[PDB]
Structure 1
């Protein structure tokens, strides 16, 4: 499927993933696309923070789901 992630900078990114795909796979894809380390990525959907070791279907993520992504860096 296709999901949309909006960052703190307002950038909207489309990710081609599946509901059965794990959170680790999505974080790895995000790291490949933008270089954000999986540990520094925080994803929020429907008031729930995505955690490693689970899948998108575990968070009731559906077609064109809107997620909030925040990256931690700097100092």
Structure 2
């Protein structure tokens, strides 16, 4: 399946993942596409924080889903 990644900057990234994969794979993908660190990458899902130790289906994510990426770094 494919999942959408909406960034707070105003960008949407579409990737290819599966409901059996792991959040670690989804974050690793966005990295190969954009180049954002996994440690700083914050995957949000309708009020849920995905973890590399979990699975896409673990949270109940379907095909063509839409997540929100967030960078956790110094700023203010």
Q: 1: CA distance between counterparts of 2:38 and 2:58? A: 18
Rounded Cα–Cα distance in structure 2 between residues aligned with 1:14 and 1:6: 9
- Inter-partner Cα distance in structure 1 for 2:70 and 2:46: 15
Larger fraction in helix: 1
State the distance in 2 between where 1:42 and 1:16 align. Answer: 18
In the TM superposition, what whole-angstrom CA distance separates every residue of 1:27-53 from its partner, at most 9, and x where no partner exists? 111111111111100011121111121
Structure 1: where are the runs of 5+ without partners? none
- Post-superposition offset of 1:14: 0.2
Runs of 4+ in 1 over 2 A off after TM superposition: 72-75
Name the residue aligned to 1:62: 62
User: How many residue pairs were aligned?
Assistant: 75
For residues 62 and 27 of structure 2, the distance between their equivalents in structure 1, rounded to whole angstroms, comes to 17
Q: How much is the aligned-residue C-alpha RMSD, in angstroms?
A: 1.4
State TM-score, norm by structure 2.
Answer: 0.89
Task: State TM-score, norm by structure 1.
Answer: 0.90
